[PDB]
């Protein structure tokens, strides 16, 4: 099949770590001899099989920045919010970006530790207010509030 | 299942059904799941959502 | 105007003393005035159990009110929504007095560490009152011996923890500093 | 605005471009290329040749405008900035804006040879006092303290890591502190200075020792105490008004730095940073702005006021507090301008009334003569549109939001003019926050629906390049056959310097009278000083500047 | 908050507490003050972190002597 051998050869371009020759790539697989693989490599954006000699070089929610993610939170004011999935699909390592855009700039929800921060898309203003001592957290909510009257 | 064999066989299976359920494809393979899953990792592009959820793609 | 400051007012309590997701429930109240619980469950993609108590923290602290949104859908089924209402003036009541008492509490540990009250025989494992003390001090003695150890005591509640509480007091004022006048900013209108 | 190197010209913000050229050729960085070859430090390639050929005479015979200077210097491998910055001592007439005669960080190159016996003209001098207010103003934010703590921590490593590199260079600058204010190599330089001085041009600064902070390690000692003290003074309960002298006293007890040593931070930072040959400056940008405040706090008092609001009132009750400091008396920078100058002229066609200017800035005029446009044709119709199609009083004083009783009248005004008026219509809203709700709610109804088809509408936007692209596509439309309408802000950038000829404007609309009370009590605190130091009340000051802003836009 | 620099105050305060007899401002001279400031920085900064605090304890020995100078 054309795709299977082409996939292995194109995957071999980045694995070798070298821009191996156009033909010498095929003999390394020893089975891929079609021109569609060469056509695909020539059609490959990641595999820079340019007009020159054989050169084997490696390469939804387009919000790849905290500036763009902040805009997403701005677009979802009084609106719904996706959790974390397409956010990291269009931008690898959102979680570090979440902490960098802290204090309601990447206002997420750390749903679980093993969930890779299954975030939430919400938009706050100051967000963090972490300076409150957890003792004052203890001291704030132990208060019996009078009812209607 | 060799990586080239997985690459050809999975593509042979993906040519039959690349847009197939991730559970259904494995039962169509029934081999040591590391080989079939690994071939899905480079010789396919995962679509977790949508109508073709968990369906191999390229 | 003022009610907008009330809208932002509860954010102070919610984003300081609670977690990150607690404003995510509160934000939805400001997001939709009649906030359906079934919708708010989807908005943050949190299940029924995870979203439940979050409203209660806003309900209990007089910040929110889950209004019983009973209505008749076309199917004639038992339709209920916990419409998290925003009771703005009553949430002011909760934040106002909660700031009031905590300042007293951190003061209390200061005075207690400045007035030794009891005693202790750490040898006989016995703590004593001063009245207990004045029973076993001998006229030939300067410190009240014991009755199981016949040994002197130690003063109780000395002043080595006194300095601990002032930082708690100072941290209380410096962290509640954004909150105190934010209530009084609203209390100018009393709405 | 005058850079020619493609590497430098890419960046948008002026300071980043200014930093890149300065780091390209700096008194301590450019030396590291000539004496030892390296790829870490490049060359401007235009200051390089200016350093060789340009500073020997004047430009041949051209009186170069901005358009003309750009074209000439491009072909002749010269950067026009370094020409005119040097041309101060050679230009029989010097062309620059108000800031470079008033702003203290940039007006250190002023030459008395061109200042003593010269004649000074202030163009559009109606907006003179407002600029001076910004000159002594600075805010802070809770995000910035995180950067400030970053700069405080990162410089602590920076000054210590270079100690093992060259410790004697560290101490060599210490003996430069006991001798004086580093005058030999802090002011007699071509490129060295990095930290700007917000104080008056070196006259309001003693030359004594900056306390016992000479040591690199001991410099960390008071830096970390003072940064902690300001943070609890950054999380203040609400806006509190204390005399800036008192801030030093409260600082004095919490962190014992005397007032005279604290005035010496600005010349200290350049004295210390230069020794470390620092290579990374991103987290150190907070250092120059905070230390700019440090020079201001120890020097200015009893004329200004310190305020710390725990949030912005439009987004109240949030951890976004400000170290608000704003100038109350603009004349402190104004008076030394008149102190040295002998020939001065102030002229503006929008100043009204013309009488509070001498009392506000404390300067001596002699000829107060007013001019009326004597023409055989009217050519202008100033209008007082109190009543609309509904014949209802229209304004923007009632609120800063939209309402069907009001918005339908203003939109009906815009469409009715769009049917009849010729090409060129410019409006100036009181504020940009006001307009965003105006246009979006206008889009909700079909009021703009007929306005859509009449003319070509381009909107004022926060990004200057887009608005300039919007405005450059406004003038061409106006000159072209199709009609065009521009919408802008009375407090926006358009009212500053933009001109509108016949085509570019025929009928201008003014939605209300612009009152700047929308912001927090910062201006209310500012307005109080005007009320007691001067006999100009809130009512007299508010309407007269608002119409001055109104008359600024109309002409 | 760089707890190493937290001890800088205590070293500095101990000079403000015990070693206050040092002639920095009472002497009047700027040259004497400037040398005193450099000497103050020599004692406090080394006593602040302590990377070379072997004469800093001796500076404490002199500081205690300065306290006796205040005392006597
Ligand atoms: S050398 Fe001149 S033109 Fe080049 S970056 Fe520097 S200032 Fe700009
Ligand atoms: Zn006992």
Domain boundaries, chain C: 1-89, 90-114+159-191, 115-158
Give the span between the Cα atoms of D77 and D79, in whole angstroms. Answer: 7
Phi, psi of D458 (to 5 degrees): -125, 140
Chain E contact set for D225 (CB, 8 A): 8-9
Closest approach atom of ligand 1 to CA D48: 1
Q: Nearest bound ligand to CA D4?
A: 1
Strands (DSSP E) found in D460-524? 484-489
Q: What spacing in Å lies between the alpha carbon of C145 and ligand 2's midpoint?
A: 8
- The size of the A-B interface in CB pairs under 8 A is 31
Interface size between A and D, measured as CB pairs under 8 A = 16
CA–CA separation, D503 vs B18, rounded Å? Answer: 63
Residues in Cβ contact with A32 at an 8 Å cutoff, skipping those fewer than 6 apart: A5, A6, A8, A9, A26
Those chains having 3 or more beta-carbon pairs within 8 angstroms of chain E are D
Strand partners, D427: D487, D509
H or E, element range at C66: strand C65-71
Distance CA C4, CA D272 (A): 48
Phi-psi region of B32 (alpha: psi -120 to 50; beta: other; left: phi over 0): beta
C-alpha–C-alpha distance, residues D477 and D454, integer Å: 13
Ligand nearest to the CA of C151: 2
In whole angstroms, what is the distance from residue D432 CA to residue B17 CA?
57
**Residue B35 tokens, joined:** 């080989």
Question: Which run of H or E residues covers position A60?
Answer: none
Q: Cβ–Cβ of A4/B49 closer than 8 Å?
A: no
Dist CA D287 CA D278 (whole Å): 13
Which residue of E6, E8, E34 is in closest CB contact with D209? E34
Q: Which of E5, E31, E41 sits opposite D213 (nearest CB)?
A: E41
Residue ranges in D195-258 assigned as alpha helix (H): 216-232, 244-254
- Reading the block at residue B37, the tokens are 């899953």
The DSSP code for C69 is: E
Task: Print burial letters for C19-28: b (CB count within 10 Å at least 16), e (below 16).
Answer: ebbbbbbbbb
Nearest beta carbon to residue A139 from set C13, C62, C102: C102
| Encoded tokens for B52 | 């073709």
Distance in Å, CA C124 to ligand 2 centroid:
3
Contacts with A129 from chain D: Cβ below 8 Å: 319
Compute the CA torsion angle A125, A127, A130, A133 (nearest 10 deg). 80
- Sign of the Cα torsion D231, D236, D241, D247 reads negative
CA of D154 to the centre of ligand 1 (A): 29
Pocket test for ligand 1, best of D14, D79, D81 (most atoms within 8 A of CB): D79
Backbone angles phi, psi at D102, to 5 degrees: -115, -45
First CA to last CA across chain C, in angstroms?
Answer: 11
Task: Confirm or reject: Cβ of D46 under 6 Å from ligand 1.
Answer: yes
Alpha-carbon gap, residue D167 to D161, rounded angstroms: 10
Whether the Cβ atoms of residue A126 and residue A103 lie closer than 8 Å to each other: yes
- Taking alpha carbons only, the member of D525, D538, D527, D516 closest to residue D239 is D525
Residue C116 three-state SS: coil
Q: What is the token pair recorded at B17?
A: 């059904």
CATH number, span D380-555 = 3.40.50.300
Note every long-range contact of A74-81, with CB atoms under 8 Å and residues 24 or more positions apart, other chains counting.
A74/A123, A76/A121, A76/A122, A76/A123, A77/A123, A77/C31, A78/C30, A78/C31, A78/C32, A79/C31, A80/A121, A80/C42, A80/C43, A81/A120, A81/A121, A81/A122, A81/C43, A81/C44, A81/C45
Q: By the CB < 8 Å criterion, does C5 face chain A?
A: no
CA distances from A22 to A56, D41, D238, D273, D378 (A): 8, 40, 71, 54, 81
Mutate to test the interface with D, among C1, C2, C7, C8 (most CBs of D within 10 A): C8
Q: Cα separation of C150 and A125, whole Å?
A: 66
Distance, in Å, from the CA atom of B38 to the CA atom of B2, rounded to the nearest integer, reads: 11
Say how many Å lie between the CA of residue C120 and the centre of ligand 2.
Answer: 9
Among D212, D331, D328, which residue's Cα sits nearest to residue D264?
A: D212
Does ligand 1 lie within 6 Å of residue D44's CB atom?
Answer: yes
Q: In chain E, which residues have their Cβ closer than 8 Å to the Cβ of D218?
A: 8, 41, 44-45, 48
Does residue D520 contact residue C5 with C-beta atoms inside 8 Å? no
Residue D325 pairs in a beta bridge with D138, D306
Contact predicate E9/E53, CB 8 Å:
no
Asked if the Cβ–Cβ distance from C105 to A145 is below 8 Å, we say no
Judge whether B26 and B58 are in contact, CB under 8 Å: no
Nearest CA in chain B to A31: B4
Neighbours of C99 (CB within 10 A): 18
Angle of helix E56-71 relative to helix E30-49, nearest 10 degrees, comes to 130
Secondary structure of residue D384 in the 3-state scheme: coil
Both tokens assigned to C4: 């907008």
Integer angstrom CA distances of residue C15 from C39, C44, C108, D359, D481: 22, 16, 27, 49, 57
Q: Is D325 left (phi over 0), alpha (psi -120 to 50) or beta?
A: beta
Cα D195 to Cα D171, D268, D292: the distances in Å are: 20, 9, 8
Assess contact for C10 and C183: CB atoms under 8 A.
no
Compute chain B's Rg from CA coordinates.
10
Query: CB contact, 8 Å: D319 with chain A?
Result: yes
- How far, in Å, from the CA of D540 to the mean position of ligand 2? 84
Instruction: Give the span between the Cα atoms of D490 and A43, in whole angstroms.
Output: 55
User: Which tokens go with D254?
Assistant: 């919490």
Give Cα A82 distance to the centre of its chain.
14
C-alpha distances in Å from residue D246, one per residue of A18, C14, D250, D407, D521: 68, 35, 6, 48, 21
Cα(C150) to ligand 2 centroid in Å equals 6
Calpha distance E12→D223 (Å, rounded): 13
> Closest ligand 1 atom, CA of D17?
5
Contacts of A121 (CB under 8 A, 6+ apart): A72, A73, A76, A80, A81, A82, A83, A87, A108
Half-sphere exposure of D456 (CA within 13 A, CB side): 20
Rounded (10°) CA dihedral C139, C140, C142, C144: -70
CB-ligand 1 contact for D284 (6 Å cutoff): no
> Are the C-beta atoms of residues B56 and B44 closer than 8 Å to each other?
yes
Residue D78 contacts residue D46 (beta carbons within 8 Å): yes
For residue E8, what is the nearest residue in chain D, using CA coordinates? Answer: D221
Ligand 1 atom, smallest distance to D44 CA: 1
As a residue count, chain E comes to 72
D499, D474, D475, D472: which is closest to D553 by C-alpha?
D499
Neighbours of ion ligand 2 (CB under 5 A): C 121, 123-124, 146, 148-149, 151
> How many Å apart are CA D364 and CA A80, to the nearest integer?
63
Q: Is D511 touching ligand 1 by the criterion CB < 6 Å?
A: no
Cβ atoms of residues D354 and D345 within 8 Å: no
Tokens of D126: 């109606």
Which ligand 1 atom is nearest residue D46's CA? 1
Q: How far apart are CA E46 and CA E33, in angstroms?
A: 19
Residue A14 host element (H or E):
helix A2-16
Taking CA–CA distances from D311, the nearest residue in chain A reads A126
- Is the CB of D316 less than 8 angstroms away from the CB of C185? yes
Residue A9 token pair: 């050869």
How far apart CA A128 and CA D146 sit, in angstroms, is 13
How many Å lie between the centroid of ligand 2 and the Cα of residue C138?
16
Q: Which of A6, E42, A7 is nearest to D214 (CA)?
A: E42
Q: Are D243 and D315 in contact (CB under 8 A)?
A: no
Beta strands at C154-155 and C119-120: parallel, antiparallel or unpaired? antiparallel
Is the CB of D73 inside a 6 Å radius of any atom of ligand 1? no
- Angstrom distance (rounded) from CA C73 to CA C75: 6
**CA D6/CA D131 separation, integer angstroms:** 33
Tell which D residues from 304 to 323 touch C, by Cβ distance under 8 Å.
310-311, 313, 315-319, 321
Q: Do E37 and D208 touch (CB under 8 A)?
A: no
Judged by its nearest atom, the ligand closest to the C-alpha of residue C120 is 2
**CA angle, residues D463, D467, D473, in degrees to nearest 5:** 155
The alpha carbon of C43 is separated from its chain's Cα centroid by a whole number of angstroms, namely 29
Q: Is D82 in the pocket of ligand 1 (CB under 6 A)?
A: yes
Token pair listed for A26: 């095929």
Q: Write down the residue that tokens 């940008």 correspond to.
A: D285
Q: How was this structure determined?
A: cryo-EM
Contacting residues for A39 by C-beta, under 8 A, at least 6 apart: none
Among the listed residues B14, D253, D520, D512, the one whose alpha carbon sits nearest the alpha carbon of residue E13: D253
Residue at token pair 């997420």? A108
E38 CB neighbours in chain D (<8 A) are: 174, 178, 212, 214
The CA distances from residue C96 to A125, C90, C183, D30, in Å, are 22, 10, 7, 61
Return d(Cα E34, Cα E28) in angstroms, integer: 11
Residues D146 and D131: their CA atoms lie apart, in Å, by 30
Resolution of the model in angstroms: 3.1
Sort out which chain D residues have CB atoms less than 8 A from E42's CB and list them.
Answer: 215
Distance CA D175, CA D182 (A): 10
Interface test with C, best of D316, D319, D320, D517 (most C CBs within 10 A): D316
**CB of D487 sitting under 6 A from ligand 1:** no
**D277 Cα distance to chain centroid:** 29
What's the rounded Cα separation, in Å, for the pair D116 and D93?
Answer: 14
DSSP-assigned letter for residue D88 = G
């Amino acid at each position: 099949h054309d795709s299977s051998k082409l996939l292995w050869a194109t995957e071999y371009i980045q694995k070798k770590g070298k821009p191996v020759l156009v033909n010498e790539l095929l003999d390394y697989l020893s089975m891929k001899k079609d021109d569609k693989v060469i056509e695909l490599l020539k059609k490959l954006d990641r595999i820079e099989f340019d007009p020159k000699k054989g050169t084997f070089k490696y390469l939804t929610y387009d919000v790849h920045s905290p500036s763009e993610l902040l805009k997403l939170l701005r677009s979802q004011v009084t609106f719904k919010g996706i959790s974390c999935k397409d956010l990291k699909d269009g931008w690898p390592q959102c979680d570090e970006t979440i902490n960098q855009l802290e204090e309601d700039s990447k206002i997420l929800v750390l749903r679980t530790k093993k969930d890779k921060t299954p975030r939430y898309v919400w938009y706050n203003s100051g967000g963090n207010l972490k300076c409150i001592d957890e003792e004052f957290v203890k001291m704030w909510e132990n208060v019996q509030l009078p009812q209607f009257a | 299942m060799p990586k080239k064999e997985i690459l050809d066989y999975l593509f042979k299976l993906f040519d039959e059904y690349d847009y197939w359920s991730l559970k259904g494809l494995k039962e169509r393979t029934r081999q040591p799941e590391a080989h079939l899953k690994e071939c899905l990792d480079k010789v396919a592009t995962l679509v977790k959502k949508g109508p073709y959820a968990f369906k191999y793609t390229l | 105007p003022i009610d907008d400051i009330v809208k932002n007012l509860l954010k102070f309590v919610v984003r300081g003393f609670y977690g990150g997701s607690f404003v995510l429930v509160l934000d939805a109240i400001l997001f939709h005035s009649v906030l359906a619980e079934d919708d708010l469950k989807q908005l943050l993609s949190i299940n029924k159990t995870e979203l439940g108590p979050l409203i209660a923290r806003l309900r209990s602290d007089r910040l929110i009110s889950i209004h019983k949104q009973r209505e008749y859908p076309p199917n004639s089924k038992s339709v209920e929504r916990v419409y998290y209402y925003v009771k703005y003036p009553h949430a002011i009541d909760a934040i106002k007095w909660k700031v009031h008492q905590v300042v007293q509490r951190l003061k209390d540990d200061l005075d207690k560490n400045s007035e030794p009250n009891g005693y202790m025989c750490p040898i006989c494992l016995t703590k004593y009152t001063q009245l207990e003390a004045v029973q076993l001090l001998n006229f030939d003695r300067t410190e009240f011996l014991c009755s199981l150890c016949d040994e002197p005591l130690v003063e109780d509640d000395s002043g080595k923890k006194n300095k601990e509480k002032q930082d708690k007091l100072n941290r209380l004022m410096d962290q509640i500093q954004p909150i105190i006048d934010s209530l009084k900013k609203i209390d100018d209108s009393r709405i | 605005n005058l850079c020619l190197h493609p590497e430098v010209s890419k960046e948008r913000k002026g300071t980043v471009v200014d930093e890149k050229c300065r780091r390209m050729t700096n008194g301590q960085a450019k030396r590291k290329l000539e004496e030892d070859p390296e790829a870490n430090v490049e060359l401007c390639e235009y200051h390089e040749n200016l350093y060789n050929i340009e500073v020997e005479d004047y430009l041949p015979k051209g009186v170069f405008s901005f358009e003309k200077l750009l074209k000439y210097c491009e072909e002749k491998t010269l950067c026009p900035y370094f020409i005119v910055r040097r041309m101060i001592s050679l230009c029989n007439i010097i062309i620059y804006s108000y800031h470079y005669l008033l702003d203290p960080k940039i007006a250190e190159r002023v030459s008395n040879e061109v200042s003593k016996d010269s004649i000074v003209i202030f163009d559009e001098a109606h907006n003179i006092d407002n600029v001076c207010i910004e000159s002594l103003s600075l805010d802070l934010t809770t995000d910035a303290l995180r950067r400030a703590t970053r700069g405080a921590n990162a410089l602590d490593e920076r000054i210590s890591e270079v100690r093992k590199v060259d410790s004697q260079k560290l101490q060599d600058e210490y003996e430069k502190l006991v001798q004086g204010l580093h005058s030999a190599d802090i002011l007699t330089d071509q490129e060295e200075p990095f930290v700007e001085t917000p104080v008056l041009p070196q006259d309001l600064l003693t030359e004594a020792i900056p306390g016992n902070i000479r040591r690199a390690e001991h410099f960390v000692s008071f830096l970390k105490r003072l940064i902690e003290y300001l943070k609890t003074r950054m999380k203040v309960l609400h806006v509190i008004s204390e005399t800036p002298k008192s801030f030093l006293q409260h600082l004095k007890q919490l962190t014992f730095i005397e007032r005279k040593p604290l005035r010496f931070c600005s010349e200290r930072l350049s004295l210390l940073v230069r020794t470390l040959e620092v290579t990374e400056v991103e987290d150190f940008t907070a250092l120059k702005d905070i230390a700019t405040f440090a020079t201001l706090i120890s020097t200015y008092e009893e004329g200004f006021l310190l305020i710390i609001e725990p949030y912005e009132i439009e987004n109240a009750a949030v951890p976004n507090p400000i170290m608000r400091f704003t100038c109350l008396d603009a004349s402190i920078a104004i008076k030394p301008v008149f102190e040295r100058f002998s020939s001065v002229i102030i002229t503006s066609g929008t100043i009204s009334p013309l009488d509070m200017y001498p009392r506000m800035l404390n300067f001596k005029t002699v000829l107060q003569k007013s001019y009326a446009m004597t023409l055989a044709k009217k050519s202008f119709l100033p209008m007082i549109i109190t009543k609309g199609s509904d014949q209802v009083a229209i304004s923007s004083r009632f609120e800063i939001r939209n309402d069907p009783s009001i918005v339908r009248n203003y939109g009906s005004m815009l469409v009715e003019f769009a049917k009849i008026t010729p090409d060129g219509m410019v409006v100036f809203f009181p504020s940009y926050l006001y307009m965003e709700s105006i246009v979006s709610m206008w889009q909700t109804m079909g009021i703009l629906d007929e306005v859509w088809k009449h003319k070509l509408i381009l909107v004022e936007t926060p990004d200057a390049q887009e608005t300039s692209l919007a405005l450059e596509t406004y003038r061409k439309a106006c000159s072209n056959g199709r009609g065009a309408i521009l919408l802008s802000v009375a407090r926006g950038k358009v009212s500053e310097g933009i001109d509108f000829d016949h085509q570019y404007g025929r009928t201008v609309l003014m939605i209300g009278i612009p009152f700047q009370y929308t912001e927090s009590r910062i201006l209310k605190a500012r307005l109080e000083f005007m009320r007691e130091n001067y006999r100009i009340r809130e009512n007299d000051f508010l309407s007269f500047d608002a119409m001055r802003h109104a008359a600024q836009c109309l002409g | 908050d760089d707890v190493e620099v937290e001890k800088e105050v205590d070293i500095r305060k101990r000079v403000f507490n015990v070693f206050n007899k040092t002639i920095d401002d009472f002497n009047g001279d700027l040259v004497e003050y400037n040398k005193y400031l450099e000497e103050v920085e020599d004692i406090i900064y080394k006593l602040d972190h302590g990377i070379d605090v072997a004469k800093t304890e001796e500076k404490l020995r002199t500081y205690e002597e300065l306290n006796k100078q205040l005392i006597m």
